[PDB]
Write a protein that binds this ligand. Structure first.
Ligand SMILES: [K+]
Ligand SMILES: [K+]
Ligand SMILES: [K+]
Ligand SMILES: [K+]
Ligand SMILES: [K+]
Ligand SMILES: [K+]
Ligand SMILES: [K+]
Ligand SMILES: [K+]
Ligand SMILES: [K+]
Ligand SMILES: [K+]
Ligand SMILES: [K+]
Ligand SMILES: [K+]
Ligand SMILES: [K+]
Ligand SMILES: [K+]
Ligand SMILES: [K+]
Ligand SMILES: [K+]
Ligand SMILES: [K+]
Ligand SMILES: [K+]
Ligand SMILES: [Mg+2]
Ligand SMILES: [Mg+2]
Ligand SMILES: [Mg+2]
Ligand SMILES: [Mg+2]
Ligand SMILES: [Mg+2]
Ligand SMILES: [Mg+2]
Ligand SMILES: [Mg+2]
Ligand SMILES: [Mg+2]
Ligand SMILES: [Mg+2]
Ligand SMILES: [Mg+2]
Ligand SMILES: [Mg+2]
Ligand SMILES: [Mg+2]
Ligand SMILES: [Mg+2]
Ligand SMILES: [Mg+2]
Ligand SMILES: [Mg+2]
Ligand SMILES: [Mg+2]
Ligand SMILES: [Mg+2]
Ligand SMILES: [Mg+2]
Ligand SMILES: [Mg+2]
Ligand SMILES: [Mg+2]
Ligand SMILES: [Mg+2]
Ligand SMILES: [Mg+2]
Ligand SMILES: [Mg+2]
Ligand SMILES: [Mg+2]
Lengths: 170, 123
RNA sequence: UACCCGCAGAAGAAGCACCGGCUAACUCCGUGCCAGCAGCCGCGGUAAUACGGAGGGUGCAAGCGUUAAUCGGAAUUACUG
RNA sequence: AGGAUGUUGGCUUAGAAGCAGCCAUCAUUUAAAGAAAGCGUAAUAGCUCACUGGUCGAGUCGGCCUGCGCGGAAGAUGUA
RNA sequence: CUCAACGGAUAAAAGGUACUCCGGGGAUAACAGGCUGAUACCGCCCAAGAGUUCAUAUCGACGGCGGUGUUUGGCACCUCGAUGUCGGCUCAUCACAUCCUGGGGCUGAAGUAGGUCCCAAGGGUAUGGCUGUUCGCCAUUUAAAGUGGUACGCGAGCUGG
RNA sequence: CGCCCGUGAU
RNA sequence: CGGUGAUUGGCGCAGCCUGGUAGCGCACUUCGUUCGGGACGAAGGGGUCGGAGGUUCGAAUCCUCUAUCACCGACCA
């Protein structure tokens, strides 16, 4: 939470590679590990759009089995029926709220699809998809994207990211 | 005197062998199509490597009927079966390159001079 | 025409693949599990004879390599065996 | 007939000169004239208006209370 | 004596009937008519805005006023000594709130093609697949495939899904 | 009597 | 639509009858044990009761209205 936070952090998304003498390896061997940072902004989540009767067409007809209603949307062209109760007003009310649900879920389904789309766009946290290397053996850091070197790893690991953010902000 | 559900043979070599009439074009409540009349067809059987596939919806022009055409002096020309030539759906131009069997002089019009030239015999 | 004679002048006439082991022939620089190599084993993760260039070598030579396809090696269908 | 001047008043916009919108809104000359009520232009330009003279020679203007009318006013056997 | 069903029938008692039956009731429902018109549909009033500017070409919020009888209803006036039900077929007939054809005004109307409103009822106004369907979706047409009233027209005219 | 597990560098 | 019962700690549940004190399992936190993890052992913390308004000296508890969820019925023509 801050002012212009996403602007500063949006350049960190990607996979970070670490080379280091493993402490979890019994043989004390040199291993490589990966983890991923993904930054996305907060959204206003406006789905407050509601039913405007200017663009609703309603039909009442005789039940299949004039109590049955058939509501349809003028621009979207998605229909709704109800034959629950013998009073059409009960049916007429139930469909538009069901119609409201139907409008609403398209918006949700539309947003659900784009989230899976960016899930597919994310790189795997594995060999080759790195954007920064943090090889702590010889105490070298290399942003292989810009590409800015550094020989002071401890400072970077504590929050000296001012070296990389500005250059990554092409 | 072709109407809906009538099965027609195919006079060209588009690939089709049998077509069914599904509409007589050119007027409201129109019953019959004679020689020279455009119809909407669907293909009911084709040869294995033709230009048209079974199930297609196309246009056609009737070129032989066994009801016949009546000439100005009172004569009649009847054939032994009904036949049509497949047309493109939009340009209404022939799809095939050959015509089999005789055709008649009621096709002598600006639209079907392509068919008249190809016909082995015009009556 | 083949051949023969006369003229002038070093003048018009050299590349391709390899160099870790098998397999003949090695060092420097650049890169840093990347880029790339690779027939098999395998090389590259900051001092690489294995990647790329340079110097030097080695093998063939108006050709030299790669790919495809057959037999050999394969005694790995064995009659010999 | 005339209906001006500083002044494209300030800001952003590309433009804001009257007009996308924002804050306001003085002076000069006669007689009257605006940081503009209206149409048009992208902005112009332009065409109005408000305003004042000359002609003309009797009334004229728009509010209030009231009487009676007009529109709003489409259906199925036949005026109905 | 929660005889509380509280002027308390017995000390002591639950259900099915589409297999049904009788006496009655339009005193009382279901269908259609009637009255009404909340709802529905059609129209109009004000105009915040949208339309580059520009409320009113075209839309029109927050609110308001009517018409029709036309959907879903309210009521219980007719009919229970009977007023046969949905759809299809056949045959229709009227209204106009006009789908096409005809005549016009404005257009954010160059032309072709449109949008919207006014006048106009002479004639015209699809065939199939699915489903008992009316409806609807779909295929392919047409100048167009109008919206309603008529016991949701029509079984002493047919059918009977 | 009961005792599960030990990623990946070459 | 009516009608009958539920909302309590991060999750699953008691407590309400019959007003004065919220409890349990898992989870969480610390310590111990082990080379380390799990299991195990010893300590410890966290909830004002869906919301709102009433009655009462006092409300998780009683009453009324709401929101969400669950069950049930919607029957003759
Ligand atoms: K042998
Ligand atoms: K009693
Ligand atoms: K009984
Ligand atoms: K029974
Ligand atoms: K009836
Ligand atoms: K009335
Ligand atoms: K009106
Ligand atoms: K009314
Ligand atoms: K009756
Ligand atoms: K009719
Ligand atoms: K009329
Ligand atoms: K017309
Ligand atoms: K017009
Ligand atoms: K007419
Ligand atoms: K249906
Ligand atoms: K009958
Ligand atoms: K009937
Ligand atoms: K009768
Ligand atoms: Mg090196
Ligand atoms: Mg080698
Ligand atoms: Mg052999
Ligand atoms: Mg009349
Ligand atoms: Mg009593
Ligand atoms: Mg009886
Ligand atoms: Mg009565
Ligand atoms: Mg009814
Ligand atoms: Mg009734
Ligand atoms: Mg009435
Ligand atoms: Mg506007
Ligand atoms: Mg009624
Ligand atoms: Mg009474
Ligand atoms: Mg009656
Ligand atoms: Mg009688
Ligand atoms: Mg009219
Ligand atoms: Mg059927
Ligand atoms: Mg009827
Ligand atoms: Mg009758
Ligand atoms: Mg039968
Ligand atoms: Mg039956
Ligand atoms: Mg495990
Ligand atoms: Mg192991
Ligand atoms: Mg309270």
């Amino acid at each position: 939470s801050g002012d212009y936070a996403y602007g500063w952090l949006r350049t960190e998304t990607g996979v970070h590679r670490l080379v280091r003498k493993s402490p979890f390896d019994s043989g004390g061997r040199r291993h490589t590990s990966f983890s991923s940072a993904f930054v996305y902004p907060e959204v206003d989540d406006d789905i407050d759009i509601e039913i405007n009767p200017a663009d609703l067409r309603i039909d009442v007809y005789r039940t299949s089995g004039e109590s049955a209603v058939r509501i349809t949307h003028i621009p979207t062209g998605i229909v709704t029926q109800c034959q629950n109760d013998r009073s059409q007003h009960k049916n007429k009310d139930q469909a538009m709220k069901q119609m409201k649900a139907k409008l609403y879920e398209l918006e949700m389904q539309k947003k659900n699809a784009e989230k899976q789309a960016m899930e597919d766009n994310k790189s795997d946290i594995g060999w080759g998809s790195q954007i920064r290397s943090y090889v702590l053996d010889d105490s070298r850091i290399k942003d292989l994207r810009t590409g800015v070197e550094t020989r002071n790893t401890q400072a970077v690991l504590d929050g000296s990211l001012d070296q990389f953010i500005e250059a990554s902000l092409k | 005197m072709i109407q809906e559900q009538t099965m027609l043979n195919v006079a060209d070599n588009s690939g089709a062998r049998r077509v069914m009439c599904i509409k007589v074009l050119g007027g409201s409540h129109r019953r019959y199509a004679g020689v020279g009349d455009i119809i909407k067809i669907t293909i009911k059987e084709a040869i294995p490597r033709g230009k048209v596939k079974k199930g297609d919806v196309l246009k056609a022009v009737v070129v032989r009927t066994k009801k016949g055409v009546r000439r100005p002096d009172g004569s009649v020309i009847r054939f032994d079966g009904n036949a049509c030539v497949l047309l493109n759906n939009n340009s209404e131009q022939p799809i095939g390159t050959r015509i089999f069997g005789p055709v008649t002089r009621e096709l002598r019009s600006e639209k079907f001079m392509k068919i008249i030239s190809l016909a082995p015999e015009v009556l």
